[PDB]
Amino acid sequence: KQYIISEELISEGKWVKLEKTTYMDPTGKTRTWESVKRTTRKEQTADGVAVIPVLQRTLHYECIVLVKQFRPPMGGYCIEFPAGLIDDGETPEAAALRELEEETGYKGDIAECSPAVCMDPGLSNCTIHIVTVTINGDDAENARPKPKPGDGEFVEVISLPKNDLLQRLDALVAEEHLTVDARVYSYALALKHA
């Protein structure tokens, strides 16, 4: 029923643009919307990937590996799933494993990969694949993992037990002035609601 009529540029940057979107509502009335888009998207299925990294070790509870970084748009520190943009020609799966190794040092194995999902659809067209990855923490390659961050990336790794994720995240927030990512919190809520 509803569809895009046109997209007028309002302002471009090196990395992000703002657009005035004209669209047809279900009554036949024309309406407008201010939309944000990244400038970097190619023939990728999505802008980025987020990795759900499940650290598995014998005689240990499973952990979910997360990353803490300063995020300039937020003006503060955020706790997130390891994540980044998909390179031109890279598969979501390869980007997931690469970004996980870069940001955390862990070498994972693909478990599953989502279709493209929207980050904030009332505001942007940004999409990711959410890729679930198991990390064999008993393999020697994952013994003392060293991050290989790229230029301008500064990451601290935080691994929290899956069986208590939400309480552990609430404790971090109580002690240390930082924001939890909405996908991380949604995941933690569902672990409790199950």
Added chain:
Amino acid sequence: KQYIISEELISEGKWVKLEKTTYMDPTGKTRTWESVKRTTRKQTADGVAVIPVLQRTLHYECIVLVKQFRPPMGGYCIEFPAGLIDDGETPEAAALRELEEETGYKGDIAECSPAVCMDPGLSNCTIHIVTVTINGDDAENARPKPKPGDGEFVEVISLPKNDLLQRLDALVAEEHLTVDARVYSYALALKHAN
């Protein structure tokens, strides 16, 4: 260690602005970032998203979701009921109001998150995620009628909690819709909790 040095406006709109953020990295090097902000914040957060658990005796619990055309995405999206918090409104009151508006259901607050980030590599947008139970056997929830505001066109989709991820994957396979990343994260964790 890291902090904001300055924020240059690049373009404002009625609802969204684009900013060049200058910040200090942990090595003492000055760097820049293109950031998006909403112009509407007054509030603990921009918005709320509601996790509505429809509970009816002798039925599977359902998660109530909404399908809407999203102009930034150029297509239809499946999301938790959600909207912006009004000036002076508590997150909890906004959650119950937006849930009744978008779905017709009258719920009860179960829990409320701290402010969580939507896409911290890109914007400063935040929400409270509010978990709400809906007593589907109460007569008030028998024949619920949405009361959408101006420009809101919502289809309500209830899916069983015990099979949410498979049900969402099936919708995506049959219908060309995008699932919201928080919805998908929640659905994954329902499966991963085993």
